[PDB]
């Protein structure tokens, strides 16, 4: 009923930067040799897609944000093997093209044909899938969740689990990978090490559920709000620090307390003053510090090379260092195994239409994460 | 004839920064429990005893340099059970109690009781065995080389080949080492992989020659000076780049030449601007890039985080991330076995007397390495 023709559908358009998001009735033309097109079920909210808004992160406007959602498949287009209609998927922002150097590499995840770097807010094709009111409309990441209903490439997209809760699992494909995979797939925290967790957001509660699930026998939480350290003990961390107790600087305190400096130290703020700290505190012989993400308008951070003369590894990551299309359904599987639990970074669910309304919650104040619904 | 007894030699004594070296009598205390005397047979110069002279790298004044350098084991103290007597040894300048943190560690090298984070230049008991006319003379790393005899504590002594030729496994000690480790041990180069070298001195072609033990297919060297072409293609460089030659900046040449960024980029140069050059130029997906040294008076680097998030990773290490005890007897076998040759790296030997003529060499031009031999 609706497979191979034009769909009219619901979705948040960002005609503009600094502009709230215009509920519009959209066309979601049909998907062409391997594209699929999904129906959203869930979408959640992340900085990422208000940076947008702001100018920050630059990206053909107007646009169809978000890229942590999933739903299902409606229908799929020519050569389209990995899914088929009905299937519970996870659009993907960082694809997995499987032919890139980067897809071959047995490491790198961040896929050639990603759309992030030079964003063209296009498909693969180079065009796009939507129109509103005839005015062609943007992707986003190759994958516009904000839209009742999406096209994304097959390199794009992921098979997950039947039986996956849509309104949580959602959270795999940026939020909670980005964080679990910081320290599961890219730091690689081990069994008994000591890690320390700067910025205890969405992103952080992630990668501390990444050490517990590596092992660490301490996990410092370190973090301006003492609102924040429930969750994360809750979570997993066995301690956090309030920096703003101290005389003394933090990295200080965290040297003192690990003995010698953390096994991994993880900044999931975004800010360079504390990106440089969340390294000058990891023991300095072997300590790998992980800059889970970074603001899209950062300017340079003034360091000491001396740091990493003593031999301490630094490290960034797209997306957990995850192979998104491998992964995504590993990681959810795991989930469905009943190991880690989404529930705690949840902290609110809002009808789509409330989405402007969802970044208000982002924007200022404390939401760990929002899911939209549809 | 020796043994036991207090030895009178020459070295070289550095009573002020800034001053040539004095060949001083010196009086060379025996060795205690856990202490080893050695007769020095050769001592290369190195940029880090040059620094020592300069004040930046601040060590206790006035002092017996050298920390590259291979001899003959003359006394050992009580319960040496290492050495005995007669054995060819290279004295490291970064130890390995095998207690600490760092020893245990499975891949940190910096052991917690080496004496560069904070120098004291004396022996594990915070004393010296160095007297000039009754003035009591500090120790360097716990080496001090630039001396016909020295004592060194058994962390700090490394039992070599009997066939080991002393005047080319000196390099062992510092140079060499740390290039090869870089390459080898630390950055990890693997078959098949094009490696691109910041810098064409010694500790550079010892990085080429360790990403030729690695297998690197491609190994771009990179330096101002066109004269250092020669020796590193010989020595392994399949390639060498003067960014002089061009007009868009070198990081963008050897992404172009290397068609996305290379898989390994090494600095063995010390520059801050060139540091961060050598990381902006490896896959932005998985790319490595290794700070071989930095100079010891160095200061903020400027550098936009965006640079890691890729995935790009950036350590650094001190002695090639070996882990000097286990490792030196093994580089040794290695040159033994006729892998590597060292010959390369010699372009001076200068009798030890002529230790302030080697230092202008290294100061002023090109000496690859200048080996004093005693
Ligand atoms: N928003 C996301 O879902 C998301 C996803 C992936 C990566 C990231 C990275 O994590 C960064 C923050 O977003 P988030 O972690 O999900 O949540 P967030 O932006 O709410 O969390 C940042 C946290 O760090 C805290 N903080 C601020 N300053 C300091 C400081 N000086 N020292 C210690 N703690 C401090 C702050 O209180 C908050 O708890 C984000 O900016 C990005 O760089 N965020
Ligand atoms: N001196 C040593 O034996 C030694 C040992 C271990 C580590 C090191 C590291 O290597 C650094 C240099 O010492 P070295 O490599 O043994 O020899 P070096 O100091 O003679 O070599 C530095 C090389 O880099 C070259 N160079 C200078 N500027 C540039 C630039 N802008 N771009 C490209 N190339 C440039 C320069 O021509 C020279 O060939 C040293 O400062 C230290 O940081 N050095
Ligand atoms: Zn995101
Ligand atoms: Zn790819
Ligand atoms: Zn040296
Ligand atoms: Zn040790």
Same mark, same amino acid.
Request: proline share 5%; net charge positive.
């Given at each position: ?8 559908? =619901?979705?948040?358009?960002?005609? /503009?930067?600094?502009? @709230? +998001?215009?509920? /519009?009735?959209? /066309?979601?033309? @049909? ?18 897609? &208000? ?44 694809? $997995? ?6 897809? !071959?590499? @047995?490491?790198?995840?961040?896929? #050639? ?7 063209? *807010?296009?498909? $693969? ?14 992707? %986003? ?24 809760? #849509? ?20 730091? !690689? ?41 429930? =969750?994360? =003990? ?13 005389? =003394?600087?933090?990295? /200080? ?6 003995? *010698?400096?953390? &096994? +991994? ?29 970074? @603001? ?10 001396? #740091? ?10 797209? %997306? *957990?260092? +995850? ?35 969802? %970044? &208000? ?14």
């Amino acid at each position: 009923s609706t497979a191979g023709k034009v769909i009219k559908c =619901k979705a948040a358009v960002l005609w /503009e930067e600094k502009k @709230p +998001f215009s509920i /519009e009735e959209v /066309e979601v033309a @049909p998907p062409k040799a391997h594209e699929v097109r999904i129906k959203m079920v869930a979408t959640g909210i992340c900085r990422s897609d &208000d940076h947008v808004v702001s100018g920050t992160l630059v990206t053909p406007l107007p646009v169809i944000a978000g890229h942590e959602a999933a739903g299902i498949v409606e229908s799929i287009g020519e050569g389209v093997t990995t899914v088929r209609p009905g299937d519970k998927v996870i659009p993907l922002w960082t694809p $997995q093209c499987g032919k890139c150097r980067v897809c !071959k590499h @047995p490491e790198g995840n961040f896929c #050639l044909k990603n759309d992030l770097s030079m964003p063209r *807010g296009t498909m $693969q094709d180079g065009t796009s899938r939507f129109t509103c009111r005839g005015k062609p409309i943007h992707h %986003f990441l190759g994958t516009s969740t904000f839209s009742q209903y999406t096209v994304v490439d097959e390199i794009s997209v992921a098979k997950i689990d039947a039986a996956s809760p #849509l309104e949580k699992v959602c959270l795999i494909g940026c939020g909670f990978s980005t964080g679990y995979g910081s320290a599961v797939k890219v730091a !690689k925290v081990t069994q008994g090490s000591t890690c320390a967790v700067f910025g205890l957001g969405g992103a952080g509660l992630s990668v501390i559920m990444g050490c517990k699930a590596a092992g660490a026998a301490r996990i410092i939480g370190v973090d301006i709000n003492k609102d924040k350290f429930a =969750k994360a =003990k809750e979570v997993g961390a066995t301690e956090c620090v309030n920096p703003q107790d101290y005389k =003394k600087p933090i990295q /200080e305190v965290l040297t003192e307390m690990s003995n *010698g400096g953390v &096994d +991994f130290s993880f900044e999931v703020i975004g800010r360079l003053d504390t990106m440089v700290t969340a390294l000058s505190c990891c023991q300095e012989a072997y300590g790998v510090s992980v800059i889970v993400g970074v @603001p899209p308008d950062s300017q340079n951070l003034s360091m000491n090379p001396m #740091l990493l003369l003593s031999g301490r590894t630094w490290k960034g990551a797209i %997306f *957990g260092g +995850f192979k998104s299309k491998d992964s995504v359904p590993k990681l959810v599987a795991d989930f469905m195994a009943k190991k880690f639990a989404l529930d705690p970074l949840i902290t609110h669910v809002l009808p789509f239409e409330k989405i402007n309304e969802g %970044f &208000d919650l982002l924007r200022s104040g404390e939401s760990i994460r929002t899911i939209l619904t549809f």
